[PDB]
Design a protein around this nucleic acid. Structure first.
Ligand code: SAM
Ligand code: SAM
Ligand code: CU
Ligand code: CU
Lengths: 85, 97, 97, 95
RNA sequence: GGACCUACUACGAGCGCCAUUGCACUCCGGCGCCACGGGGGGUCC
RNA sequence: GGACCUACUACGAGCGCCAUUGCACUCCGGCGCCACGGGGGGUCC
């Protein structure tokens, strides 16, 4: 149950800056977001981390937006293995 | 109200968002329902918060209205209707895109 | 008519039991907001009718927008705003339960 | 991943009774054609999930096509084609 | 088998809490409470 | 400083292909094509 949530199976064809703002459009409803980091690197291409201020927010986001088709690709959300700053 | 058009009219959108972000962010959510032709956005920030999403088939518009209704988009739940008939083009020609 | 918080649904599948129908309607209309009651007409002359009563008018409007003509039990339901004060007058006269 | 006769639904509202869910799904998916069975298990492994078995794949295709992401009991369902065939389907074909 | 009872028992049903996003078609996650129902026990017809 | 050009250079921005389902919080997978932009290089008013 980390604050940060780990999203993968994202549409890799989307630019990093566009993707960041597109994710904020959906996850802003759940609470205060601090940052959304997206690497378009080979190691972390279809992936993103969304950091919520409260754990209630991250839980509600994982609860609700699981399997949501994002750019026609359904997102796979997990709790992050490690805690964020 | 309206009849099943292939275009849907979205309003009650967050006016604080730039036009470029909104067009692209709407595509992120509504692309799942089918092929999108255009995404038109009210060009007046004073009275913005409106948008048109033009689908190829009416099936896409219908399914989109059912599912994404009341969806919190930028923490504001959007209000989706069927667009009036051939009205998506009227505002495009008249310059509100 | 005028935007009521209650919506009047008719053209319902008559073969369906009252208990199943109420619960199946709740399955679809819960997304639009909080539902107070779901009234179903147990009359033979005035059969195939139902009332879904919402807390907020915003909920009923989105429901009419989206679920209009929705094939429910293979029969497309036809939604209108309830005529003002009809639901209660129906709940009193027992025609709806 | 390929047009199966059954569709696999998950992200269902777990609080709903098995028979209510079975009947509520039939209320929605009967429009697409004749349904053979709707399998529902409220067990830890298979809860929040359902299988809808159609006679024709055309019905199943239209069902995934139309009702995808549809909020059912305020929870939007996520529809897939089933991986395997259903046992009732298998006998028709024999496998 | 009816009617009032009970220093007993959560078995059904019914509420909530936690956990689970899981591809099945040989039951079956874990708690807390419990209207009505069972099981035991007692007093009459 | 304007106008047309380059046996040159993919530095941006923009397209596609193959491969990858990967848990981060300094950084970088491989090709092919390139509108419009820069860098270098010329002929002119
Ligand atoms: S009843 C009695 C019925 C009567 N004994 C009979 O056989 O017809 C018992 C009541 O006590 C409650 N009860 C059941 N099990 C219980 C337990 N383990 N502890 C406390 N109360 C219980 C139930 O709610 C039920 O209404
Ligand atoms: S003006 C320069 C033009 O040369 C083209 N260009 C830039 N680099 C190039 C290269 N390495 N090889 C061939 N053409 C190039 C650009 O498309 C630009 O429009
Ligand atoms: Cu007893
Ligand atoms: Cu140059």
């Amino acid at each position: 149950p980390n604050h940060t949530i780990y999203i993968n199976n994202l549409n890799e064809k989307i630019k990093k800056d566009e993707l960041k703002k597109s994710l904020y459009a959906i996850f802003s409803q759940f609470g205060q977001i601090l940052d959304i980091l997206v690497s378009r690197s080979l190691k972390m291409r279809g992936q993103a981390f969304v950091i919520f201020k409260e754990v209630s927010s991250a839980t509600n986001a994982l609860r609700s937006m699981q399997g949501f088709p994002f750019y026609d690709k359904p997102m796979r959300i997990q709790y992050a293995k490690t805690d964020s700053d």
